[PDB]
Amino acid sequence: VQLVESGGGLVQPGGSLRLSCAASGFTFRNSAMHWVRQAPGKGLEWVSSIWYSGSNTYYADSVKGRFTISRDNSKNTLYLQMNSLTAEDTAVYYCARFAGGWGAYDVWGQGTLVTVSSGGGGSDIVLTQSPATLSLSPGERATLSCRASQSVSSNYLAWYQQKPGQAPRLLIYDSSSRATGVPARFSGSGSGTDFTLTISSLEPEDFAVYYCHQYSDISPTFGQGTKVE
Amino acid sequence: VQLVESGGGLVQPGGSLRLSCAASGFTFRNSAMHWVRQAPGKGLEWVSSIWYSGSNTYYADSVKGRFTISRDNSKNTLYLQMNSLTAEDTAVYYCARFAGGWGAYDVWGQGTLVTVSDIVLTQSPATLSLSPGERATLSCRASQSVSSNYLAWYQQKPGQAPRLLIYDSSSRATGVPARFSGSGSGTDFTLTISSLEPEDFAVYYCHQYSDISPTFGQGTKVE
Amino acid sequence: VQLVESGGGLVQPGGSLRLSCAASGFTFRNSAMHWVRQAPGKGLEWVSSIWYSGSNTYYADSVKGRFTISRDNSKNTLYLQMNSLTAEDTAVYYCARFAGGWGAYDVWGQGTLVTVSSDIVLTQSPATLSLSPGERATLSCRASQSVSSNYLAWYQQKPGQAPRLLIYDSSSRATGVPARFSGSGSGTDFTLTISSLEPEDFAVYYCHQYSDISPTFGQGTKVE
Amino acid sequence: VQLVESGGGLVQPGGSLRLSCAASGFTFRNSAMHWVRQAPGKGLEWVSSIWYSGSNTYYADSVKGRFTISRDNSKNTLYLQMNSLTAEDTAVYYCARFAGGWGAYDVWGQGTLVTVSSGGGGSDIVLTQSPATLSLSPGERATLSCRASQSVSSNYLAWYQQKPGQAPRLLIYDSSSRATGVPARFSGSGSGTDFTLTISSLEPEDFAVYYCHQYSDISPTFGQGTKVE
Amino acid sequence: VQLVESGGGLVQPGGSLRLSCAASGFTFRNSAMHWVRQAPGKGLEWVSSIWYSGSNTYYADSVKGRFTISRDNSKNTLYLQMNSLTAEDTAVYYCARFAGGWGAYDVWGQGTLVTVSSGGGGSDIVLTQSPATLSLSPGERATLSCRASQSVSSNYLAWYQQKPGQAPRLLIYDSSSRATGVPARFSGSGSGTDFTLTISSLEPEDFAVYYCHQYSDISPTFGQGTKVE
Amino acid sequence: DIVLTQSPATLSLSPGERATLSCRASQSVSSNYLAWYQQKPGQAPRLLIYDSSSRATGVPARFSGSGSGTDFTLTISSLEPEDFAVYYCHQYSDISPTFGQGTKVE
Amino acid sequence: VQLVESGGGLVQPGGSLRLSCAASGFTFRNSAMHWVRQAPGKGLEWVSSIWYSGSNTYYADSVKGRFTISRDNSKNTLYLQMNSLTAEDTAVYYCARFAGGWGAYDVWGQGTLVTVSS
């Protein structure tokens, strides 16, 4: 009683890949077969399902319209055709026999890693903002930090304010240059890998989420935001 | 059916005051009489109780040893002697007849106020959640200007005495790592911990010593 | 440069205790010595001060009239006499040397805990209700333990005036109370309902248990 | 039913203190009374027990010979006399009525803090050794670190070697001076707050525990040791 | 150049002992002499110090008030009088000559073991609680385990709740009996060596430390606690 | 099997006098688990002393128990008219409970 | 806190009889319950004992194999089934709560007379 999986690998975004799973030890023609995936460092996520040819194949919203599950009962083989791949599809994909009330997912393939990427061995510039949250009162000072994993060339770092339901608004660019119409109580500083946004005296209209942003290369990245409450 | 209160007023700490409550309209000889107080802008708090003879008088520990409840049934009057008063005894004191299953505190006196009697420091934020390596920026804002910039910062770890970090607003104490730094003047002072270590997670207090009545901020927890 | 503290402990209210702090490593004869205390879960608070003599001694209003600070320079010892203690004096007391412009409180004693101390907690909900005339006010009183005999009462208090009985024995409407007030519940969960609010009904409402020797009140619900 | 405690406080090592517990609301003279303590940030620990006349008083092994439990049924009071106190006796002490199969410790005193200390602390220079353990082979290099919390004046820092069951052996003193008879493969270096002991090529006799030691003030301190196995 | 130690041994808590160290091969009258101790499986710890005519003896805070260092230069002997001994004094004690900048502790005694015990090897029933910490939300169930090294006769096991700064509260006794005033959401079960405390639906006031406790013999023991946060 | 022997079998006394009753066990009574009971004509026994020396709740102070091992004594300091009855000692130190044969105070 | 006893009476030798004891005011389910008897003009005599589930029930030699002690914790009731009765069983029988170190027989039933005669 075994499922022998094959396929996967590293592919470009928008590319195509086909996974296969060869069964033995049970009457494959009668069994419902599913695909399950697991993103790196994440939990299990159902992908697709196929049953007898009098039923309908099912897909998760994540893959419906791009992936095709199929089976060839004469070869006891399950297939997953993966088209129009995106970096969000990066995961280990498992084939599994579904037994419902008689065993749930009782037989699993060993899993194959599918990574969808166009990048090299280097990483993008990662921005880490701290703290995640600041609870303050009007009149008080807010000091926000943005630290980069690599030095930001030319100090090409910007700060944005975003209020609920609204688009982000530019506050600071080039690390220290205050945008047009921005009150003087906003000020940025720092260079290289250490940047700071300071709000000298908070007003009630300053309570929002603040993002830092580096534009020193072709791969723009944002910080994850600091919420000022 | 009435309770007429008298007494109270403004008193020095450690002083003494007596309260009285004169009853009419019911058989005061038999009634259980209680005292209840209410601090300014607070809830009701029971103080003391007295009943018939052959019964125990009761006090709350806030007042046990300093207050004396008594009654003279021949004058239909209830008394409360309050000695060694402290600023936390400031409250409005009510006399009340206790009827238990027949009305609880169904009759109240009108109540009398007993009151026994600088630069405020406000720190921000109240709480900071950070990781090692990150920067902590602490604020201290005084209600008036701190002359000579006589403002200090202390670190306190749980269960231990406070520890001097910075005084004179910017002067870092002997043996304090350089990652601690203070700034500001007048009414806005700031303590910055440039790169946190796990032993730096503690409560931090600012402190002004520029006058006769030294005051502290209420502390910021860095967790 | 040490300060060796001793004393403290658990005592009954109105009792007495003495704290001492023995100094070494500096010219204690010349040093300004202070006492500082910290209640559980509270901030640092100055208590008293003593100087050269020259001795205009200083106290906080919380302790002035009951506490006595003193010093014996021949033994390098600081003293704090605590009389007529109250539950609000419960705190950890620190001795400290005051260096002013040359170190503020640069040396601290280890601190000693003084506890003056020795029931049924009432929790009201919600803390606040904003309503209009004609609307329904529903008040809850949740007890930490069962209230025997349903000995729970409700009082209404308007600003600056004494409380007034609305309901006692959980369900008994007091004399003169309009029928729009109603109480219910048993054991640990009690409710006061004001069916259709009047403009004079906007006040603070307290629940009250009198089923034992230690009567307690809820913390109040403000109806505005 | 109540237990009113009193006593406690701050005491010096070797000192004495008596704790008392006044009972009300039950037949105290018949009840078994215990003392229980709890060190700061630690769990509950039974200390002593006393019962009717004709029964044995019992003590924990840590306090047997130093503590004395007693009772005065005429005052409904329980006592604990604590002699030969040491910093390990620092705890909150509770009196408690023991009901056994009828409620275990069903009534507790409020607890009183007993702190035994001589004034610490403190100004002591803290030495931190790293790593705690090094697993190496003969011929390899051992590099040991000692970090001081404050600057070690005159670089008065020493290194000792200790093998199991033997006294420590001086290796290095004055930070860099190799003691007489110590092989040249041992060498110390560093200054201020950063010191290092290097064993250039390990021999089979070099596998032991190594301690650093500062003697630059009146309060000598040691590191907690690095084991080279 | 020798230091000959003598003394030590096994003593009961509260007892007394005197250690001696006889020097030869150097001008003992000029040397500063220290005592150093080492608890079993622990690091080195300085104890006391003594020097010349102007007797300026120093002690560690742990022993100040209980130990007395002295010297008799006419017999070239160092002494350590140890009073008010406790199990925390159990250690190997070394005498050592202090040479400061000319050798630190360059000469050590061989060490003598001092053990302070009243006969404690352990017939006591050990209770192990698991897990040490539980992070849950209001409304969820908390299941706490208490395991005994030996069978708990008559199921004399109790459960206590302790909030910070307050005395413990009896929750459960006789393994399954709910104490007076305890809400029905608390329940205990189990027998012999396997016991469980269950909080069916957590309330915000139920977040506290919980201890199990066996009273089936004359050496009562507690579990080490489970924190529900 | 622990035999309890009370003495004397009969005590003739007046109000105000002292009653001293003795119970001797054939073996040592473990933990001093010995109790005293008072029984009046036609009534159930009523506990006076347990654990050799513990006076039960509601029992007047004039009753007091003492002793250990094999020799136990119940003392009634000042006999009242209501104290004249039969008194039994009782050991519960093992799984085989035994009683004394009683001492009648008359 | 009381024990309400019932049963007894006059029955012929070799007959059978059941005694009952209804408890209130304490956690009966956890208490050890004993039966004690007293022959006319004689002293107290232990008869039987019962404890928690998992413990041994005990009988005096004079009743072993004929008497049966039992309990119904749901009804807080103690029973004594007395079979094969003989003139030697004539006595007043008491139910009692056994508190051990915390009060020995601190609660007694009022007793019921069982007489065996023809």
Q: E224: exposed, middle or buried (C-beta count within 10 Å: 0-12, 13-18, 19+)?
A: middle
Does residue C101 sit in helix, strand or coil? Answer: helix
Does residue F97 sit in helix, strand or coil? Answer: coil
Torsion of CA C168, C174, C179, C180, to 10 degrees: -60
**Pairwise CA distance, residues D7 & D228, whole Å:** 49
The distance of D110 to chain F (nearest Cα, Å) reads 26
Starting at the earlier edge strand, list the strands of the sheet with D127-130: D127-130, D142-148, D194-199, D186-191
Q: What type of residue is F43?
A: Q
Judging contacts by C-beta atoms under 8 Å, the chain G residues touching residue F89 are: none
Q: Is B198 on the interface with D (CB under 8 A)?
A: no
**Dihedral sign of CA atoms C48, C50, C56, C57 in order:** positive
- Only one residue has tokens 């590191």, namely D223
Q: Where in chain B is the domain with CATH 2.60.40.10?
A: 1-117, 118-223
**Pairwise CA distance, residues E160 & E162, whole Å:** 7
Preceding omega of B125 cis (within 30 degrees of 0):
yes
The domain A122-229 having CATH identifier 2.60.40.10: the answer here is yes
**Pairwise CA distance, residues C166 & C157, whole Å:** 10
**Pairwise CA distance, residues B181 & D131, whole Å:** 31
Q: For chain B, state the CA radius of gyration.
A: 26
Q: Is B100 on the interface with C (CB under 8 A)?
A: yes
Judging contacts by C-beta atoms under 8 Å, the chain E residues touching residue G52 are: 154
User: What is the DSSP annotation of E35-61?
Assistant: EEEE-TTS-EEEEEEE-SSS---EE-T
Judging contacts by C-beta atoms under 8 Å, the chain E residues touching residue C146 are: 181
The two beta strands, E194-199 and D67-72, are unpaired
CATH architecture of the domain formed by A1-121: Sandwich (2.60)
| Contact predicate D36/D109, CB 8 Å | no
E19 DSSP β-pair partners:
E80
Among candidates E213, E11, E226, which has minimal Cα distance to E124? E213
* CATH number for the domain harbouring residue G110: 2.60.40.10
- In order of B34, B44, B89, E83, G70, the CA distances from B40 in angstroms are 20, 10, 10, 56, 64
Does residue B111 sit in helix, strand or coil? Answer: coil
Half-sphere exposure of G56 (CA within 13 A, CB side): 4
Q: Where in chain D is the domain with CATH 2.60.40.10?
A: 1-121, 122-229
Could F53 and D54 be called an inter-chain contact, meaning their C-beta atoms sit closer than 8 Å? yes
- Only one residue has tokens 């939990």, namely A43
Which experimental technique did the depositors report for determining this structure? Answer: X-ray
| Contact predicate B2/B95, CB 8 Å | no
Residue C28 phi/psi, 5° resolution?
-55, -30
Q: Is D126 on the interface with E (CB under 8 A)?
A: no
Give me F103's structure tokens: 């001492």
C139 DSSP β-pair partners:
C192
Give me D134's structure tokens: 């090094």
Resolution stated for this PDB structure, in Å? 2.0
Q: What type of residue is B4?
A: V
| Contact predicate D24/D87, CB 8 Å | no
Judging contacts by C-beta atoms under 8 Å, the chain B residues touching residue C104 are: 150, 152, 164, 167-168, 207, 209
**Pairwise CA distance, residues B168 & B151, whole Å:** 5
Does residue G107 sit in helix, strand or coil? Answer: strand
| Contact predicate A132/A144, CB 8 Å | no
Chains in contact with G, counting 3 or more C-beta pairs less than 8 Å apart as contact:
D, E, F
Among candidates B194, B218, B214, B215, which has minimal Cα distance to B204? B218
Among candidates C70, C79, C67, which has minimal Cα distance to C109? C79
* Domain hosting residue G14, numbered range: 1-118
Could D174 and E13 be called an inter-chain contact, meaning their C-beta atoms sit closer than 8 Å? no
Q: Is G40 on the interface with F (CB under 8 A)?
A: no
Q: Is G100 on the interface with E (CB under 8 A)?
A: no
| Contact predicate C57/C69, CB 8 Å | yes
> What fold, for C119-224?
Immunoglobulin-like (2.60.40)
Judging contacts by C-beta atoms under 8 Å, the chain D residues touching residue G30 are: 101
Judging contacts by C-beta atoms under 8 Å, the chain C residues touching residue B41 are: none
| Contact predicate C24/C4, CB 8 Å | yes
Give me B39's structure tokens: 């601090």
The distance of D86 to chain C (nearest Cα, Å) reads 15
Judging contacts by C-beta atoms under 8 Å, the chain C residues touching residue B217 are: 43
**Pairwise CA distance, residues E43 & E53, whole Å:** 32
**Dihedral sign of CA atoms F105, G4, G10, G11 in order:** negative
Q: C120: exposed, middle or buried (C-beta count within 10 Å: 0-12, 13-18, 19+)?
A: middle
Q: Is E174 on the interface with G (CB under 8 A)?
A: yes
Of C66, C87, C101, the CB nearest to B168: C101
- In order of C22, C78, D78, the CA distances from C96 in angstroms are 11, 10, 36
The distance of Cα D199 from the centroid of its chain, to the nearest Å, equals 32
CATH number belonging to the domain at B118-223, selected among 1.10.10.10, 2.60.40.10, 3.20.20.10, 3.10.450.710: 2.60.40.10
| Contact predicate C20/C113, CB 8 Å | no
| Contact predicate A97/A105, CB 8 Å | yes
**Pairwise CA distance, residues C210 & D113, whole Å:** 33
Could C104 and B150 be called an inter-chain contact, meaning their C-beta atoms sit closer than 8 Å? yes
| Contact predicate C6/D9, CB 8 Å | yes
Which of G38, G44, G46, G106 should we substitute to test contact with F (largest number of F Cβ atoms within 10 Å)? G44
Q: Is E165 on the interface with C (CB under 8 A)?
A: yes
Half-sphere exposure of D216 (CA within 13 A, CB side): 25
Of G34, G43, G106, the CB nearest to F47: G106
Give me A150's structure tokens: 């690599």
Could E156 and D101 be called an inter-chain contact, meaning their C-beta atoms sit closer than 8 Å? yes
Chains in contact with F, counting 3 or more C-beta pairs less than 8 Å apart as contact:
D, G
User: What is the chain A residue with the closest CA to B135?
Assistant: A145
| Contact predicate B95/B77, CB 8 Å | no
Does residue C138 sit in helix, strand or coil? Answer: strand
Q: F69: exposed, middle or buried (C-beta count within 10 Å: 0-12, 13-18, 19+)?
A: middle
Half-sphere exposure of C156 (CA within 13 A, CB side): 20
The domain C1-118 having CATH identifier 2.60.40.10: the answer here is yes
**Pairwise CA distance, residues A187 & A171, whole Å:** 8
Does residue C136 sit in helix, strand or coil? Answer: coil
Give me C185's structure tokens: 């519940």
**Pairwise CA distance, residues E80 & A122, whole Å:** 65
Residues contacting D133, CB < 8 A, separation 6+: D226, D227, D229
**Beta strands in D25-126, from DSSP E residues, in sequence order:** 32-38, 44-50, 58-59, 67-72, 77-82, 91-98, 105-108, 112-116
**Pairwise CA distance, residues D161 & B70, whole Å:** 77
**Pairwise CA distance, residues G78 & G80, whole Å:** 7
**Pairwise CA distance, residues D229 & D207, whole Å:** 5
Which of B49, B58, B59, B86 should we substitute to test contact with C (largest number of C Cβ atoms within 10 Å)? B86
**Pairwise CA distance, residues C71 & C33, whole Å:** 9
**Pairwise CA distance, residues E103 & E105, whole Å:** 6
**Pairwise CA distance, residues B124 & C147, whole Å:** 43
Residue C82 CB neighbours (<10 A):
22
**Dihedral sign of CA atoms G41, G43, G48, G50 in order:** positive
Judging contacts by C-beta atoms under 8 Å, the chain C residues touching residue E165 are: 40-41
- In order of A148, D168, D173, D178, D187, the CA distances from D213 in angstroms are 40, 12, 9, 15, 15
E36 DSSP β-pair partners:
E46, E94
- Only one residue has tokens 């406000």, namely B122
The two beta strands, D127-130 and D142-148, are antiparallel
Q: What type of residue is F48?
A: L
| Contact predicate D145/D130, CB 8 Å | yes
DSSP structure class, residue D102 = G
Residues contacting C194, CB < 8 A, separation 6+: C136, C137, C139, C180, C181, C201, C223
Q: D117: exposed, middle or buried (C-beta count within 10 Å: 0-12, 13-18, 19+)?
A: buried
DSSP structure class, residue E133 = E
The distance of E123 to chain C (nearest Cα, Å) reads 35
The distance of F35 to chain G (nearest Cα, Å) reads 7
User: What is the chain E residue with the closest CA to C121?
Assistant: E205
Of D27, D29, D55, the CB nearest to F31: D55
Give me B127's structure tokens: 């709480």
What's the N-to-C CA distance of chain C in angstroms? Answer: 58
A72 DSSP β-pair partners:
A77
Q: Is G101 on the interface with F (CB under 8 A)?
A: yes
3-state helix/strand/coil string of E175-227: CCEECCCCCCCEEEEEECCEEEEEECCCCHHHCCEEEEEECCCCCCEECCCEE
**Pairwise CA distance, residues D9 & D112, whole Å:** 8
Half-sphere exposure of G69 (CA within 13 A, CB side): 25
Domains of chain F, CATH where assigned? 1-106 (2.60.40.10)
| Contact predicate C222/C125, CB 8 Å | no
The domain B1-117 having CATH identifier 2.60.40.10: the answer here is yes
Does residue E28 sit in helix, strand or coil? Answer: helix
Give me E155's structure tokens: 């199921």
| Contact predicate C54/C67, CB 8 Å | no
Does residue F44 sit in helix, strand or coil? Answer: coil
Torsion of CA C129, C131, C133, C134, to 10 degrees: -90
Q: Is B193 on the interface with A (CB under 8 A)?
A: no
**Pairwise CA distance, residues E7 & C143, whole Å:** 64
| Contact predicate G110/G21, CB 8 Å | no
Q: Is F51 on the interface with D (CB under 8 A)?
A: yes
Give me D212's structure tokens: 């650093």
| Contact predicate D127/E66, CB 8 Å | no
Preceding omega of C126 cis (within 30 degrees of 0):
yes
Which of B122, B128, B137, B141 should we substitute to test contact with A (largest number of A Cβ atoms within 10 Å)? B137
Q: Is C213 on the interface with D (CB under 8 A)?
A: no
User: To the nearest 5 percent, what fractions of chain B are helix, strand and coil?
Assistant: 5, 50, 45
The distance of C14 to chain D (nearest Cα, Å) reads 13
**Dihedral sign of CA atoms C158, C160, C163, C164 in order:** negative
The distance of E165 to chain C (nearest Cα, Å) reads 8
**Dihedral sign of CA atoms B159, B165, B169, B174 in order:** positive
| Contact predicate E119/D61, CB 8 Å | yes
Among candidates G80, G94, G104, G92, which has minimal Cα distance to G31? G104
Could D65 and E15 be called an inter-chain contact, meaning their C-beta atoms sit closer than 8 Å? yes
**Pairwise CA distance, residues E154 & G42, whole Å:** 35
The distance of D123 to chain B (nearest Cα, Å) reads 10
CA angle at residue A9 from A6 to A10, to 5 degrees?
Answer: 170
User: What is the DSSP annotation of C175-201?
Assistant: TT--TTEEEEEETTEEEEEESS--GGG
**Pairwise CA distance, residues D210 & D192, whole Å:** 20
**Pairwise CA distance, residues E36 & E30, whole Å:** 19
Among candidates C159, C154, C165, C168, which has minimal Cα distance to C205? C154
Q: What type of residue is E223?
A: G
Could G52 and E177 be called an inter-chain contact, meaning their C-beta atoms sit closer than 8 Å? no
**Pairwise CA distance, residues E145 & E226, whole Å:** 9
Residue A167 CB neighbours (<10 A):
7
**Pairwise CA distance, residues A197 & A210, whole Å:** 9
| Contact predicate E195/E175, CB 8 Å | yes
| Contact predicate D116/D39, CB 8 Å | no
CA angle at residue F89 from F86 to F92, to 5 degrees?
Answer: 145
